Protein backbone atom coordinates (compact mmCIF):
# COMPACT_ATOMS: atom_id res chain seq x y z
CA UNK A 1 0.00 0.00 0.00
CA UNK A 2 1.24 3.63 -0.50
CA UNK A 3 1.88 3.79 3.26
CA UNK A 4 3.91 0.58 3.84
CA UNK A 5 7.67 1.04 3.41
CA UNK A 6 9.14 -2.46 3.88
CA UNK A 7 8.08 -6.03 4.62
CA UNK A 8 8.74 -8.83 7.10
CA UNK A 9 8.35 -12.61 7.19
CA UNK A 10 6.43 -14.72 9.72
CA UNK A 11 9.67 -14.73 11.81
CA UNK A 12 10.03 -10.90 11.71
CA UNK A 13 13.02 -10.89 9.34
CA UNK A 14 13.11 -8.30 6.57
CA UNK A 15 12.36 -9.59 3.07
CA UNK A 16 11.44 -6.52 1.01
CA UNK A 17 11.96 -2.76 0.88
CA UNK A 18 10.54 0.20 -1.02
CA UNK A 19 13.28 2.24 -2.68
CA UNK A 20 12.82 5.74 -1.15
CA UNK A 21 13.15 7.60 -4.52
CA UNK A 22 11.46 5.41 -7.17
CA UNK A 23 8.98 3.63 -4.84
CA UNK A 24 9.82 0.33 -6.54
CA UNK A 25 9.34 -2.73 -4.34
CA UNK A 26 12.47 -4.87 -4.11
CA UNK A 27 12.89 -8.33 -2.59
CA UNK A 28 15.91 -8.94 -0.37
CA UNK A 29 17.38 -12.39 -0.83
CA UNK A 30 20.17 -13.30 1.63
CA UNK A 31 23.56 -13.65 0.01
CA UNK A 32 24.50 -17.28 -0.43
CA UNK A 33 26.13 -18.97 2.54
CA UNK A 34 26.53 -22.38 4.05
CA UNK A 35 28.89 -24.72 5.76
CA UNK A 36 32.10 -26.02 4.23
CA UNK A 37 33.06 -29.64 4.81
CA UNK A 38 36.35 -31.27 3.84
CA UNK A 39 36.63 -34.92 2.82
CA UNK A 40 40.06 -36.31 3.68
CA UNK A 41 41.24 -39.89 2.96
CA UNK A 42 43.56 -39.46 5.97
CA UNK A 43 47.04 -37.97 6.12
CA UNK A 44 48.60 -41.45 6.35
CA UNK A 45 47.36 -42.23 2.80
CA UNK A 46 47.16 -39.02 0.74
CA UNK A 47 47.07 -35.24 1.15
CA UNK A 48 44.34 -34.84 -1.49
CA UNK A 49 41.06 -33.44 -0.17
CA UNK A 50 37.62 -32.64 -1.56
CA UNK A 51 35.49 -29.66 -0.48
CA UNK A 52 31.69 -29.69 -0.21
CA UNK A 53 29.98 -26.29 -0.28
CA UNK A 54 26.74 -27.26 1.43
CA UNK A 55 23.36 -25.99 0.25
CA UNK A 56 24.48 -24.03 -2.84
CA UNK A 57 24.51 -24.42 -6.61
CA UNK A 58 27.83 -25.07 -8.34
CA UNK A 59 27.07 -22.16 -10.68
CA UNK A 60 26.79 -19.76 -7.73
CA UNK A 61 30.06 -21.10 -6.30
CA UNK A 62 31.88 -20.72 -9.62
CA UNK A 63 30.59 -17.15 -10.00
CA UNK A 64 31.60 -16.25 -6.44
CA UNK A 65 35.04 -17.76 -7.11
CA UNK A 66 35.49 -15.82 -10.35
CA UNK A 67 34.36 -12.53 -8.75
CA UNK A 68 36.65 -12.99 -5.68
CA UNK A 69 33.53 -12.90 -3.46
CA UNK A 70 33.77 -16.29 -1.71
CA UNK A 71 34.83 -15.75 1.91
CA UNK A 72 37.52 -18.48 2.33
CA UNK A 73 40.79 -17.33 0.78
CA UNK A 74 41.88 -20.80 -0.42
CA UNK A 75 40.84 -22.25 -3.78
CA UNK A 76 40.40 -25.83 -4.97
CA UNK A 77 41.50 -26.32 -8.57
CA UNK A 78 38.58 -27.12 -10.89
CA UNK A 79 39.18 -29.65 -13.68
CA UNK A 80 35.54 -29.67 -14.83
CA UNK A 81 35.25 -33.33 -13.89
CA UNK A 82 36.21 -32.42 -10.30
CA UNK A 83 33.02 -30.33 -9.86
CA UNK A 84 29.87 -32.37 -9.22
CA UNK A 85 26.46 -31.05 -8.17
CA UNK A 86 24.82 -33.05 -5.36
CA UNK A 87 21.65 -32.38 -3.43
CA UNK A 88 23.74 -31.79 -0.30
CA UNK A 89 25.82 -29.15 -2.08
CA UNK A 90 28.55 -28.57 -4.63
CA UNK A 91 31.42 -31.08 -4.35
CA UNK A 92 34.69 -29.72 -5.80
CA UNK A 93 37.76 -31.95 -5.90
CA UNK A 94 36.27 -35.40 -6.61
CA UNK A 95 35.56 -37.13 -9.91
CA UNK A 96 32.04 -38.56 -10.10
CA UNK A 97 31.77 -42.07 -11.55
CA UNK A 98 28.81 -44.25 -12.49
CA UNK A 99 30.16 -47.31 -10.66
CA UNK A 100 28.39 -47.82 -7.34
CA UNK B 101 4.34 -47.23 -13.19
CA UNK B 102 4.66 -44.31 -10.70
CA UNK B 103 7.93 -42.29 -10.44
CA UNK B 104 9.95 -43.12 -7.28
CA UNK B 105 8.56 -46.72 -7.25
CA UNK B 106 6.46 -46.22 -4.11
CA UNK B 107 3.58 -48.47 -3.15
CA UNK B 108 0.06 -46.95 -3.15
CA UNK B 109 0.19 -46.80 0.65
CA UNK B 110 3.67 -45.26 0.64
CA UNK B 111 2.48 -42.64 -1.85
CA UNK B 112 -0.47 -41.91 0.44
CA UNK B 113 1.80 -41.63 3.49
CA UNK B 114 4.13 -39.19 1.73
CA UNK B 115 1.26 -37.09 0.36
CA UNK B 116 -0.43 -36.82 3.77
CA UNK B 117 2.65 -35.51 5.59
CA UNK B 118 3.16 -31.82 4.79
CA UNK B 119 6.48 -30.00 5.16
CA UNK B 120 6.17 -26.20 5.27
CA UNK B 121 9.41 -24.62 6.47
CA UNK B 122 9.29 -20.81 6.43
CA UNK B 123 12.01 -20.67 3.78
CA UNK B 124 12.36 -20.68 0.01
CA UNK B 125 12.38 -23.59 -2.43
CA UNK B 126 15.89 -24.07 -3.85
CA UNK B 127 17.39 -26.82 -5.97
CA UNK B 128 20.44 -27.01 -3.61
CA UNK B 129 15.11 -17.85 3.22
CA UNK B 130 15.62 -21.62 3.51
CA UNK B 131 18.98 -20.89 5.17
CA UNK B 132 17.33 -18.38 7.58
CA UNK B 133 20.12 -16.57 9.58
CA UNK B 134 23.05 -19.00 9.70
CA UNK B 135 20.66 -21.96 10.12
CA UNK B 136 21.00 -24.65 7.46
Ligand SMILES: *[C@@H]1O[C@H](CO)[C@@H](O[C@@H]2O[C@H](CO)[C@@H](O)[C@H](O)[C@H]2NC(C)=O)[C@H](O)[C@H]1NC(C)=O
Pocket residue numbers: 020021022023
Ligand atom coordinates in the same frame (compact mmCIF):
# COMPACT_ATOMS: atom_id res chain seq x y z
C1 LIG C 1 12.82 12.66 -6.75
O1 LIG C 1 11.94 11.52 -6.82
C2 LIG C 1 11.25 11.44 -8.08
C3 LIG C 1 10.32 10.25 -7.98
O2 LIG C 1 10.02 9.93 -6.63
C4 LIG C 1 12.25 11.33 -9.23
O3 LIG C 1 11.49 11.46 -10.43
C5 LIG C 1 11.77 10.46 -11.42
O4 LIG C 1 13.16 10.39 -11.78
C6 LIG C 1 13.45 9.44 -12.81
C7 LIG C 1 14.95 9.45 -13.01
O5 LIG C 1 15.35 8.47 -13.96
C8 LIG C 1 12.68 9.81 -14.08
O6 LIG C 1 12.94 8.85 -15.09
C9 LIG C 1 11.20 9.86 -13.76
O7 LIG C 1 10.46 10.25 -14.92
C10 LIG C 1 10.95 10.86 -12.65
N1 LIG C 1 9.54 10.94 -12.33
C11 LIG C 1 8.73 11.89 -12.80
C12 LIG C 1 7.30 11.82 -12.36
O8 LIG C 1 9.13 12.77 -13.56
C13 LIG C 1 13.24 12.48 -9.18
O9 LIG C 1 14.24 12.32 -10.18
C14 LIG C 1 13.90 12.53 -7.81
N2 LIG C 1 14.85 13.63 -7.73
C15 LIG C 1 16.11 13.53 -8.15
C16 LIG C 1 16.95 14.77 -7.99
O10 LIG C 1 16.56 12.50 -8.63
Ligand SMILES: *[C@@H]1O[C@H](CO)[C@@H](O)[C@H](O)[C@H]1NC(C)=O
Pocket residue numbers: 057058059085086127128
Ligand atom coordinates in the same frame (compact mmCIF):
# COMPACT_ATOMS: atom_id res chain seq x y z
C1 LIG D 1 21.88 -24.50 -10.74
O1 LIG D 1 21.44 -23.37 -11.52
C2 LIG D 1 21.17 -23.68 -12.89
C3 LIG D 1 20.78 -22.38 -13.56
O2 LIG D 1 21.62 -21.31 -13.15
C4 LIG D 1 20.08 -24.74 -12.98
O3 LIG D 1 19.87 -25.09 -14.35
C5 LIG D 1 20.51 -25.97 -12.19
O4 LIG D 1 19.48 -26.95 -12.25
C6 LIG D 1 20.79 -25.57 -10.75
N1 LIG D 1 21.19 -26.72 -9.96
C7 LIG D 1 20.35 -27.69 -9.60
C8 LIG D 1 20.94 -28.80 -8.78
O5 LIG D 1 19.18 -27.69 -9.94
